[PDB]
Design an enzyme around this catalytic site. Structure first.
Site: not given
Ligand SMILES: O=c1c2ccccc2ncn1-c1ccccc1
Ligand SMILES: Nc1ccc2c(NC3CC3)nc(-c3ccccc3)nc2c1
Length: 337
Positions: A31-33, A48, A163
């Site tokens: 997914g994207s953030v 996300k 993660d």
């Molecule tokens: O996926 C990110 C993330 C990606 C790039 C830079 C910062 C980030 N901070 C948090 N998260 C994240 C968001 C939701 C669930 C798990 C990890």
């Protein structure tokens, strides 16, 4: 009770979030953030949006798994769930999952790849990883893919693991490289060792080009398996592989990590043991001399039990979907301080 959502298109995707979250800005791409501002708390957050969370059994169960994991984590050195929401009004409508967490400045990949950290910075960063790992491990969860990019650091040097549950292969324990089915929690300790090594020297400790090369580089430092390890290896072809290899002797770490704090060399010896049975655990590592100035036995908490019985279940897409839906519904936002 349902809040008001607003729609927008961020890059190659629609986003539909509550009004609570503003000024969405892409930050990367499961997914994207987006970076957003959170009006309820005034903090910066990451939102996300999961990609096609329920298109297959595997996606459906993975969505459920990540939500379950995030909802469980309540510790300073592990990423936790600030919010989870969907624009759907009913189970039947339910199709999008968004997850909300704190936005951390950078990952360790950054702080290391631009420069070389001092010894007190290594102490503090490795301490925090071990502290979050103690917690994660106490719950019978293995991260399995610890690496600099899964480690978030803010400008204050506070660290959070992300993660749980730059080649991945470079940080993997040799038992994983060799595809052993019953590896345990200390695969994560191996990865910490590789990270800690990399922070002290500025270089990937085992930059293998593939799984064979990766093993070769590892055995070259830690030596080929002894008889005591070899007799614990159930797989004939595996045993014959390592046994057919060029018998490399264990290196003296104090000669590979020349000039490092000898307490750090010693901790590295204890993390990078070839035989996983003999490798230091996270709890044990915290009480190691090298963390003298940080370790506090009264503030290294363990986690509540986590039910992962779902992992061994074979369910339909719609059943994992409904279980995820249940978890969205029962989410209780974390205490505001
Ligand atoms: O996926 C990110 C993330 C990606 C790039 C830079 C910062 C980030 N901070 C948090 N998260 C994240 C968001 C939701 C669930 C798990 C990890
Ligand atoms: N108690 C143990 C301790 C260590 C082990 C190990 N370590 C590999 C040298 C890294 N590998 C294996 C195994 C088993 C089947 C296939 C491939 C590997 N088992 C181990 C059992």
């Amino acid at each position: 009770e349902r809040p008001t959502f607003y729609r927008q298109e961020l890059n190659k995707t629609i986003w539909e979030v509550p009004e609570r979250y503003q000024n969405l800005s892409p930050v990367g791409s499961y997914g994207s953030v987006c970076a957003a501002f959170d009006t309820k708390t005034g903090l910066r957050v990451a939102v996300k949006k999961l990609s096609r969370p329920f298109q297959s059994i595997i996606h459906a169960k993975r969505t459920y798994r990540e939500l379950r994991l995030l909802k469980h984590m309540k510790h300073e050195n592990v990423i936790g769930l600030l919010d989870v929401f969907t624009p759907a009004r009913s189970l039947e409508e339910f199709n999008d999952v968004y997850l909300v967490t704190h936005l951390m400045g950078a990952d360790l990949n950054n702080i290391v790849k631009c420069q070389k950290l001092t010894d007190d910075h290594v102490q503090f960063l490795i301490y925090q990883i071990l502290r979050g790992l103690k917690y994660i491990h106490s719950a019978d969860i293995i991260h399995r893919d610890l690496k600099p990019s899964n480690l978030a650091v803010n400008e204050d040097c506070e660290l959070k693991i992300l993660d749980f549950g730059v080649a991945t292969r470079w940080y993997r324990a040799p038992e994983i490289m060799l595809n052993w089915m019953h590896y345990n929690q200390t695969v994560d300790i191996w990865s910490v060792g590789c990270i800690m090594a990399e922070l002290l020297t500025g270089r990937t400790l085992f930059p293998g080009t593939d799984h064979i090369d990766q093993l070769k580089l590892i055995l070259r430092l830690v030596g080929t398996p002894g008889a005591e390890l070899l007799k614990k290896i159930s797989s004939e072809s595996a045993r014959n592989y390592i046994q057919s290899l060029t018998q490399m002797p264990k290196m003296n770490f104090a000669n590979v990590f020349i000039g490092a704090n000898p307490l750090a060399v010693d901790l590295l010896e204890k993390m990078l043991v070839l035989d996983s049975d003999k490798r230091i655990t996270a709890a044990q590592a915290l009480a190691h001399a090298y963390f003298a100035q940080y370790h506090d036995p009264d503030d290294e908490p363990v986690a509540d039990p986590y039910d992962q019985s779902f992992e061994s279940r074979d369910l339909l897409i719609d059943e994992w979907k409904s279980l995820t839906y249940d978890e969205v519904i029962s989410f209780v936002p974390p205490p505001l301080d």
